[PDB]
Amino acid sequence: SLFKQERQKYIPKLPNILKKDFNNISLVYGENTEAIQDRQALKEFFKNTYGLPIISFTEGESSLSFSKALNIGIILSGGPAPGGHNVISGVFDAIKKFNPNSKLFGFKGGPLGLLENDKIELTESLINSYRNTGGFDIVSSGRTKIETEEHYNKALFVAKENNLNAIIIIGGDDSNTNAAILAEYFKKNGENIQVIGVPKTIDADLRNDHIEISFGFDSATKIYSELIGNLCRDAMSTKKYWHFVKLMGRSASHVALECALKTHPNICIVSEEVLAKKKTLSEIIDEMVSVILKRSLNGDNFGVVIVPEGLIEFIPEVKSLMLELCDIFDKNEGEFKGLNIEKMKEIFVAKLSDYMKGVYLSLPLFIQFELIKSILERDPHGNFNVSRVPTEKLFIEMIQSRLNDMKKRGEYKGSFTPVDHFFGYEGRSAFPSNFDSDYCYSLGYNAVVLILNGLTGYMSCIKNLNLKPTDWIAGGVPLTMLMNMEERYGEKKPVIKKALVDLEGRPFKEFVKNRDKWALNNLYLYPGPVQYFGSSEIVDEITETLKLEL
Amino acid sequence: TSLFKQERQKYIPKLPNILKKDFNNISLVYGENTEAIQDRQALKEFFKNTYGLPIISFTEGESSLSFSKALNIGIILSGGPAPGGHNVISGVFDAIKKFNPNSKLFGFKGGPLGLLENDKIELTESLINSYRNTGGFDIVSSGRTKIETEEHYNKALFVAKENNLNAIIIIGGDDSNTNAAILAEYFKKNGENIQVIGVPKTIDADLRNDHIEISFGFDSATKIYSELIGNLCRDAMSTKKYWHFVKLMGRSASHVALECALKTHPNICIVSEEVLAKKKTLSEIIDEMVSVILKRSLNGDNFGVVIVPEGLIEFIPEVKSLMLELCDIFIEKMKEIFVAKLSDYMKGVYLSLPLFIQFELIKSILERVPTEKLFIEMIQSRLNDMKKRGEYKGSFTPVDHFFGYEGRSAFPSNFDSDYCYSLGYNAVVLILNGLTGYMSCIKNLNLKPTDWIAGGVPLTMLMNMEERYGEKKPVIKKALVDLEGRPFKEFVKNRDKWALNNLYLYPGPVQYFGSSEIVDEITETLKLEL
Secondary structure, rough: HHHHHOOOOOOOOOOOOHHHHHHEEEEEEEHHHHHOOOHHHHHHHHHOOOOEEEEEEEOOOOOOOOOOEEEEEEOOOOOOOHHHHHHHHHHHHHHHHHHOOEEEEEOOOOHHHHOOOOEEEEEEHHHHHHOOOOOOOOOOOOOOOOOOOHHHHHHHHHHHOOOOOEEEEEOHHHHHHHHHHHHHHHHHHOOOOEEEEEEEOOOOOOOOOOOOOOEEEEHHHHHHHHHHHHHHHHHHHHHOEEEEEEEOOOOHHHHHHHHHHHOOOOEEOHHHHEEEEEEEEHHHHHHHHHHHHHHHOOOOOEEEEEEEHHHHHHHHHHHHHHHHHHHHHHOOOHHHHOHHHHHHHHHHHHHHHHHHHHHHHHHHHHHHHHHHHHHHHHOOOOOOOOOOOOHHHHHHHHHHHHHHHHHHHHOOOOEEEEEEEOOOHHOOOOOOHHHHHHHHHHHHHHHHHHHHOOOOOOOOOEEOOOOHHHHHHHEEEHHHHHHHEEEEEEEEEEOOOOOOOOOOOOOHHHHHHHHHHHHHHHOOOOOOOOOOOOOOHHOOOOOHHHHHHO | OOOOHHHHHHOOOOOHHHHOOOOHEEEOOOOOEEEOOHHHHHHHHHHHOOOOEEEEEEEEEEOOOOOOOOOOEEEEEEEOOOOOOOHHOOOOOOOOHOOOOOOOOEOOOOOOOHHHHEEEEOOHHHHHHOOOOOOOOOOOEOOOOOOOOHHHHHHHHHHHHHOOOOOOEEOOOHHHHHHHHHHHHHHHHHHOEEEEEEEEHHHHHHOOOOOOOOOOOOOHHHHHHHHHHHHHHHHHHHHEEEEEEEEEOOOOOOHHHHHHHHHOOOOEEOHHHHHHHHOOHHHHHHHHHHHHHHHHOOOOOOOOOEEEEEEEHHHHHHHHHHHHHHHHOOOOHHHHHHHHHHHHHHHHHHHHOHHHHHHHHHHHOOOOOHHHHHHHHHHHEEEEEEEHHOOOOOOOOEEEEEHHHHHHHOOOOHHHHHHHHHHHHHHHHHHHOOOOEEEEEOOOOOOOOOEEEEEEHHHHEEHHHHEEOOEEEEEEEEOOOOOOOOHHHHHHHHHHHHOOOOOOOOOOOOOOOOOHHHHHOOHHHHHHHH
């Protein structure tokens, strides 16, 4: 692509501190840390790495933990987010500045590549061709979980066979749970193998007071918001369509909320608020039908609706239903064996309580099947496949009935022509914005400096992300501080706690202040394509979420 | 909206050098005279007063205008939106202001219907200013009201006079422009000086010929689709696990699918026109896709990307045949009647299809079905058997997409921005020369705007006579993919390489700031043709 050729030339921007000679970068030690919850149980699990302090960088003469060339292994883990390839080019450049004989190995297909020792050397020309591109496709990714002594030995072995000083893991809450646990295992067995994590995810559910945002979120919400903008403007143009847009975002509504603040849709559902008010499915339907009715009465027979794809895990009744289908499947593992959807399910309907079966058979037939598969297709970390559940079609179907029932009684004169959308996969491997491009490159560059100071069990961290990159602050966040205890697949396991929308936070407060105006009026915003050439103001733009929060 | 819109509202669309001249220094070049594509005789008699008009073209030179008084122009946005419509309107506005600052522009609301109800707004400079370079038809909205009853043409004429209009500009696809051609004559037929000009609009690009090189919006919509498809390709390479099936808008032709394929290099792209021409079966198409999926699995590649045009099934002769017989007899058991009495030949075909398609074909009777979810279904079946017979060891995890509505009202690219502004500006100059029944035309669209050629293509040359329900009606033949054309031939030469290898291209977002070579880029289709 001609675009591709030019964008490959962009020089990502570092924090001023990371431009210094590496033995002129010294550490500032902050407060020791606690886990978020289950501190007691996490301290006894993380014997060697619990309670590590926040690390900041500042200028000063400081001696490094290596004199000779580094060997670094690196993994792309989980679903892709725009910018991963810049984390890698940042890492590559940093180790080369340290010692030109340093070598970077990329393991293939996620953490599984590490367990099976399936790698490639990441060389200067290879890394050149990926600079500033989207995708994880330089080595590919995967969702393999590392949780057993067997996994840990193979990792140790494979790290030792490749003469690695450190492993950098780029991923979300799941991948960095691997990272924290793996660092503990190494330090526990006196292994001199360092483990650094990098905060990747479009969901933006990996963050805290120190990690201001995960990478990729900026790029993905910009792409989603333009498309949603375009649907709003097409709805205004024809005055006839109701668009229902499902967005990726399994466990949290950061993506939906950002897109709402960008576009001003007539309806955006926030899963977290749904849960807090213990809303039911039909209550949500009533609140959307209501908006649809008042708009039809203003002559507006059209609108745009956003719905987070993980909404079904925040409706307590539907959450219950899925957890029961789970349990019903965990034990009857045998009957299910070689049966089909049609019959896999007769058993389910049969093994459900009258209460849940009543909830279940209340759902449209196609939704019933989909929920089945969502439970079958859990990932290694025990995530339900929700992307796969057509929640926005569940809404459409249930709304149509409700509107028919009201046309029946002459209480709805209107014209309801729904259209469904799901924006998700087309945002994960897009070209990263300038923001994610600088942020990812800095993350990877920063990780090597943490490594050169002998740190392990840290998340690469870059603060003040709302300022010009030059003024960014660099350092490290201990992984254990983001963690709690959580029942996965039946067991109570130590994991990184996903960060959901703060219902007390400014992004949400701000949505709440306006969402009523946006419902009955047409105050759509129309964001454009991401730009990579032109005014810094346009090119280096950031998310509304990040402006409101910092 | 954005520092983006406000930065984008300031952009100055580029005109052809000829349209920058004083209007008195633009003179006409009369080309060869026209005849319809077919039914030449019937159309000559139908379009009595306007048939056989010659190709027009502009060049520099002292002339004489048909007006000195301020113009009153009505304008209509018709049919589905395409990026750039608002620039056709801004171009029109600016042109008539240059001619005479007292000229007024009236936009009728919601399509041809706003004309029939005198439902209109003056488009003043301040208002037009906020729509410059934006997507959408939303400055006045559009609609699909046909103008066909004598009562209609009569009220349309009424209302044009009610507002003192010298001309009406209609912006739309093939139907709308057939409409304008007829409307143009009805006005002439009755001794009224009201000119009607048409503007070639559609993302389908099924409105074009040897003189109309492309309809506006196609450029913008394909660039957006192509990025998203490129992004799916790159996600697919990244995780090595999904088969993405992308349906694109366009019930009638495959210009959009073909363009996106030349831009992304997907593993499969079905061209409806090619399927019709080779007279393929449904199952043959399935085999072709299965065969690709199998071979890539054998290479370790359990992932890929498929592009399919939205109108594909309607180009499968079998299927067409079946909706013929289904309409010939003419739920669960009431279809089974369709079975014993169906011809066999369609029977074996009717039963190839999944029940929800079968039951669906019955729902089509009252009158949709997914080109997308039919294929994925039928592929899953043939793979299930093949794994059961130890012939397929791969994992097939399909994901479906439909990119369409999110492309129609996006910001227009520079190309559509210049092209649409030029189209509207040009329409006024056709009007100032007293022409009517023309389509506004801009040639050489692959060169820089300044070297574009401006002129008019007579609407009747685009026509044949269609007949439905008793009446012989004039219609503009939809232009489909030329299987002898360069865009299609380029695809045929390379699609086999794209299937089994991973040669995905990754186009980026449309850019509006930066090097002319990126910002003023055009479609592959237009490069190959031009």
